[PDB]
Enzyme design. Sequence first.
Site, PDB file in Angstrom:
ATOM      1  N   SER B  48       0.820  -1.222   0.000  1.00 21.90           N
ATOM      2  CA  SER B  48       0.000   0.000   0.000  1.00 21.90           C
ATOM      3  C   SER B  48       0.853   1.270   0.000  1.00 21.90           C
ATOM      4  O   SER B  48       0.451   2.290  -0.584  1.00 21.90           O
ATOM      5  CB  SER B  48      -0.970   0.075   1.168  1.00 21.90           C
ATOM      6  N   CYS B 174      -0.338  -3.888  10.228  1.00 22.73           N
ATOM      7  CA  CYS B 174      -1.072  -3.964   8.965  1.00 22.73           C
ATOM      8  C   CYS B 174      -1.064  -5.374   8.390  1.00 22.73           C
ATOM      9  O   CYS B 174      -2.105  -6.051   8.432  1.00 22.73           O
ATOM     10  CB  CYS B 174      -0.609  -2.947   7.920  1.00 22.73           C
TER      11      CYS B 174
HETATM   12  N1  LIG Z   1      -7.644  -4.394   2.619  1.00 24.18           N
HETATM   13  C1  LIG Z   1      -6.641  -3.911   3.496  1.00 24.18           C
HETATM   14  O1  LIG Z   1      -6.855  -3.491   4.609  1.00 24.18           O
HETATM   15  C2  LIG Z   1      -5.238  -4.001   3.012  1.00 24.18           C
HETATM   16  C3  LIG Z   1      -4.950  -4.078   1.587  1.00 24.18           C
HETATM   17  N2  LIG Z   1      -3.610  -4.244   1.166  1.00 24.18           N
HETATM   18  C4  LIG Z   1      -3.405  -4.445  -0.248  1.00 24.18           C
HETATM   19  O2  LIG Z   1      -3.225  -5.993  -0.366  1.00 24.18           O
HETATM   20  C5  LIG Z   1      -2.471  -6.204  -1.497  1.00 24.18           C
HETATM   21  C6  LIG Z   1      -1.283  -7.145  -1.216  1.00 24.18           C
HETATM   22  O3  LIG Z   1      -0.326  -6.427  -0.408  1.00 24.18           O
HETATM   23  P1  LIG Z   1       1.123  -7.114  -0.186  1.00 24.18           P
HETATM   24  O4  LIG Z   1       0.972  -8.527   0.245  1.00 24.18           O
HETATM   25  O5  LIG Z   1       1.873  -6.162   0.681  1.00 24.18           O
HETATM   26  O6  LIG Z   1       1.636  -7.021  -1.724  1.00 24.18           O
HETATM   27  P2  LIG Z   1       2.769  -7.836  -2.509  1.00 24.18           P
HETATM   28  O7  LIG Z   1       3.062  -6.973  -3.713  1.00 24.18           O
HETATM   29  O8  LIG Z   1       3.900  -8.218  -1.600  1.00 24.18           O
HETATM   30  O9  LIG Z   1       2.070  -9.197  -2.985  1.00 24.18           O
HETATM   31  C7  LIG Z   1       1.248  -9.181  -4.132  1.00 24.18           C
HETATM   32  C8  LIG Z   1       1.470 -10.531  -4.899  1.00 24.18           C
HETATM   33  O10 LIG Z   1       0.617 -10.538  -5.966  1.00 24.18           O
HETATM   34  C9  LIG Z   1       1.375 -11.247  -7.086  1.00 24.18           C
HETATM   35  N3  LIG Z   1       0.684 -10.885  -8.334  1.00 24.18           N
HETATM   36  C10 LIG Z   1       0.797  -9.684  -8.956  1.00 24.18           C
HETATM   37  N4  LIG Z   1       0.063  -9.724 -10.105  1.00 24.18           N
HETATM   38  C11 LIG Z   1      -0.507 -10.942 -10.139  1.00 24.18           C
HETATM   39  C12 LIG Z   1      -1.374 -11.540 -11.023  1.00 24.18           C
HETATM   40  N5  LIG Z   1      -1.921 -11.002 -12.237  1.00 24.18           N
HETATM   41  N6  LIG Z   1      -1.795 -12.741 -10.787  1.00 24.18           N
HETATM   42  C13 LIG Z   1      -1.426 -13.444  -9.683  1.00 24.18           C
HETATM   43  N7  LIG Z   1      -0.553 -12.888  -8.781  1.00 24.18           N
HETATM   44  C14 LIG Z   1      -0.144 -11.658  -9.052  1.00 24.18           C
HETATM   45  C15 LIG Z   1       2.689 -10.775  -6.969  1.00 24.18           C
HETATM   46  O11 LIG Z   1       3.670 -11.627  -7.647  1.00 24.18           O
HETATM   47  C16 LIG Z   1       2.927 -10.708  -5.430  1.00 24.18           C
HETATM   48  O12 LIG Z   1       3.532 -11.836  -4.907  1.00 24.18           O
HETATM   49  C17 LIG Z   1      -2.035  -4.835  -2.092  1.00 24.18           C
HETATM   50  O13 LIG Z   1      -2.942  -4.346  -3.076  1.00 24.18           O
HETATM   51  C18 LIG Z   1      -2.228  -3.977  -0.820  1.00 24.18           C
HETATM   52  O14 LIG Z   1      -2.323  -2.576  -1.146  1.00 24.18           O
HETATM   53  C19 LIG Z   1      -2.532  -4.408   2.073  1.00 24.18           C
HETATM   54  C20 LIG Z   1      -2.813  -4.359   3.504  1.00 24.18           C
HETATM   55  C21 LIG Z   1      -4.110  -3.816   4.012  1.00 24.18           C
HETATM   56  O1  LIG Z   2      -2.349  -1.009   3.690  1.00 33.23           O
HETATM   57  C1  LIG Z   2      -2.985  -0.293   4.480  1.00 33.23           C
HETATM   58  N1  LIG Z   2      -4.131   0.357   4.238  1.00 33.23           N
HETATM   59  C2  LIG Z   2      -4.843   0.186   2.969  1.00 33.23           C
HETATM   60  C3  LIG Z   2      -6.225  -0.368   3.257  1.00 33.23           C
HETATM   61  C4  LIG Z   2      -6.967  -0.576   1.936  1.00 33.23           C
HETATM   62  C5  LIG Z   2      -7.121   0.753   1.216  1.00 33.23           C
HETATM   63  C6  LIG Z   2      -5.763   1.406   0.985  1.00 33.23           C
HETATM   64  C7  LIG Z   2      -4.943   1.528   2.272  1.00 33.23           C
END
Ligand SMILES: NC(=O)C1=CN([C@@H]2O[C@H](COP(=O)(O)OP(=O)(O)OC[C@H]3O[C@@H](n4cnc5c(N)ncnc54)[C@H](O)[C@@H]3O)[C@@H](O)[C@H]2O)C=CC1
Ligand SMILES: O=CNC1CCCCC1
EC number: 1.1.1.1
Lengths: 374, 374
Positions: B48, B174
């Site tokens: 994020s 987070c």
């Molecule tokens: N809903 C919430 O409260 C939260 C949302 N997020 C969001 O969660 C998501 C994941 O965050 P992280 O684990 O830190 O990210 P990260 O970038 O470490 O992991 C994402 C994974 O998705 C894979 N990937 C990318 N494109 C792909 C595709 N077309 N098909 C299959 N796999 C694919 C990547 O190779 C990578 O391993 C991000 O969008 C982040 O902003 C993160 C924490 C809080």
């Molecule tokens: O990763 C932390 N916070 C995120 C939660 C999902 C919306 C964007 C910000």
Amino acid sequence: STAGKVIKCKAAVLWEEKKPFSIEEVEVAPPKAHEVRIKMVATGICRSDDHVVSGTLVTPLPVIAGHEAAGIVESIGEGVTTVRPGDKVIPLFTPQCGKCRVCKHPEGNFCLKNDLSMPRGTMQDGTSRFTCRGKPIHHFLGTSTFSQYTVVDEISVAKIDAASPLEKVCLIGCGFSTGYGSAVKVAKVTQGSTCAVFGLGGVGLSVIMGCKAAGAARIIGVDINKDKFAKAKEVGATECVNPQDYKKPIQEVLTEMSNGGVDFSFEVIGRLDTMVTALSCCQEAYGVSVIVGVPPDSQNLSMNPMLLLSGRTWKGAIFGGFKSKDSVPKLVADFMAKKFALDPLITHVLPFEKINEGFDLLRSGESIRTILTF
Amino acid sequence: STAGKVIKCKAAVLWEEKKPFSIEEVEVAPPKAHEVRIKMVATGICRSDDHVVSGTLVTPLPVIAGHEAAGIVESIGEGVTTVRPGDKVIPLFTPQCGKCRVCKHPEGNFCLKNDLSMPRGTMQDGTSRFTCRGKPIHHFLGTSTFSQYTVVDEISVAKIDAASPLEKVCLIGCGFSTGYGSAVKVAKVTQGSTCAVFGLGGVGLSVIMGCKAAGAARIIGVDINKDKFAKAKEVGATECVNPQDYKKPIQEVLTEMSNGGVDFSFEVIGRLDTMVTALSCCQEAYGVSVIVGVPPDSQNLSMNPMLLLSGRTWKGAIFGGFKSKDSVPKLVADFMAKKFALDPLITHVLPFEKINEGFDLLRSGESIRTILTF
Ligand SMILES: NC(=O)C1=CN([C@@H]2O[C@H](COP(=O)(O)OP(=O)(O)OC[C@H]3O[C@@H](n4cnc5c(N)ncnc54)[C@H](O)[C@@H]3O)[C@@H](O)[C@H]2O)C=CC1
Ligand SMILES: O=CNC1CCCCC1
Ligand SMILES: NC(=O)C1=CN([C@@H]2O[C@H](COP(=O)(O)OP(=O)(O)OC[C@H]3O[C@@H](n4cnc5c(N)ncnc54)[C@H](O)[C@@H]3O)[C@@H](O)[C@H]2O)C=CC1
Ligand SMILES: O=CNC1CCCCC1
Ligand SMILES: [Zn+2]
Ligand SMILES: [Zn+2]
């Protein structure tokens, strides 16, 4: 005197889209193993039957439509164990085979034997039991109740109380149970909550009945036809709104009225735009929105997934989430015990031969549920 | 000797999109009423934060980003009652005011005081505590942890165990809590179920940990980077698939592997197409899909609502559904009681001054969660 023989009877055949039904003679074959032939007593006109006419809901033509009905078993095929000749029955447009993963799951009801996902317009065995002018005619959802006689698979029929009034309980075969279950089983509306119901036809009114039965404190009916409001209030709506009366989008209006979004919303129309509006109007962190209406065939909606990421839940369901064969007899028993009312939904009665007038009443906005008598 | 005074310290300022962070001296004002100034000990690099650099997530610039962290209270403003100087604390990117309708609801966690829906990049009072080269600098999600000191509102900080190892428990701020709670609290994964997890980064690995803790029998990891598969299996995946290895769409592959669809799927990437694919691969009558990944700003997905009408449930959540101030201390206590592990998520540990190298590791695919140490 008819068991084992072809029956010639009248049915309403739909030969092509956007045309009146043709009331004419068909031949109804006798039931094969695990099939049941039913003499129809009453059938409702649901908007889904009209969707077949309009092409909104695609199933093979020519077809005998009709799926919300009740009748009396005329004969049974070999191996049938759950109904007998003379029993009162409701055909089940969602089967309950009892054997697939969905039937075995505690929540699921969309049995894998259904004819909705990949429509064939046949019996389970891939053939038809209807001929008209010497031509084979398709079934609809394994029911086909716009006919004096039909043949259904055993997994698509339920035996009901022998004292049931069939001209009322036919609505338990679709519109009542769909709306009621959408509120009490699928959404699981809670005491004191605020609900919004989009579309105030027979299914929308049955969702209101279920919200009121669940103890909602507020039930906001939404319809562009203000003639629908008086009956919505009679069955439990606390307020009604017509989107065309407002300068602002109705999601913004409902959010304001509910001091930040409703607890539960229901789309009970069948429009892509109102499915997205109904989602948007539920509270962003803990709201639930249920899609009940049927979308136009093959069409996609567009929406911003931030509506879900904040915490909303979006779901849909067929037949109010009820496992059909277990639930229909219990719902009939509950109606016989006065636990819910069906008369508010019945605005018109006609003989079967006046089916086209019944569809004109629906299309004009004048009716909720016309019941046809055979 | 710093209480009540402006602190000059180093921070990582992002002056515009698609540029490296600039490590330089900033001025941090003392806390006002109901505010807390924190000396940072460790902060993680989450996708994020990268979304702010790339423009996927829009928030006012210039900004001090960072939101996954732990530190020690340096001073408190008038009226603060929940932390005191010297306490170990985790900043909360989702606040918990305790007074709004969401905070009062048993399920909701997206407190209405959040800075996500309508980003302002300020303290609750609409002003900033940061200056750099004489220019005011914005806050991020009421946290701003890429700085030796920050100032947060009391509703955006939780006191944690004084013996907690801050270089590990910062992930409870987070990525761990988000993924674990998405499985155990939002989806409510059941024992013996089949799950699919799209995205095997720090958050997806924490979803896997949650699915395993809930007793899933099968956990299918999905990622286009096969280098992620070994660690996914270490933390619980039973199988991994790379969409790039298949001729057919991965939703078809997963449906075949699960004999008709999975029980629970999770989108933990942030792409519109994989949100729709993850929904489609869950069983059509009773499947549940949870969106965790952050979509590109202002962009809508397209989907066929028959995916929901058959019975699927689609939901999303912030921070795993956890009410933040109530849950973070309990999660730290659970970690200290060995109920879950954080070391599997940590692949790199770097001094804060190497923040850009930490982002390069994330963008190259090489890291899960680099911890920056102050
Ligand atoms: N809903 C919430 O409260 C939260 C949302 N997020 C969001 O969660 C998501 C994941 O965050 P992280 O684990 O830190 O990210 P990260 O970038 O470490 O992991 C994402 C994974 O998705 C894979 N990937 C990318 N494109 C792909 C595709 N077309 N098909 C299959 N796999 C694919 C990547 O190779 C990578 O391993 C991000 O969008 C982040 O902003 C993160 C924490 C809080
Ligand atoms: O990763 C932390 N916070 C995120 C939660 C999902 C919306 C964007 C910000
Ligand atoms: N999910 C399921 O299992 C079932 C789904 N259906 C579907 O439910 C829907 C409702 O069925 P019925 O109640 O029989 O239909 P109906 O046509 O009687 O009621 C629909 C109502 O929606 C109103 N409406 C139309 N456009 C509107 C708009 N833009 N905004 C607000 N209101 C609008 C109409 O004025 C009408 O009163 C149909 O799409 C039907 O096919 C019906 C039963 C089973
Ligand atoms: O109205 C009865 N059945 C409907 C159920 C929703 C899909 C189309 C058919
Ligand atoms: Zn079945
Ligand atoms: Zn709050």
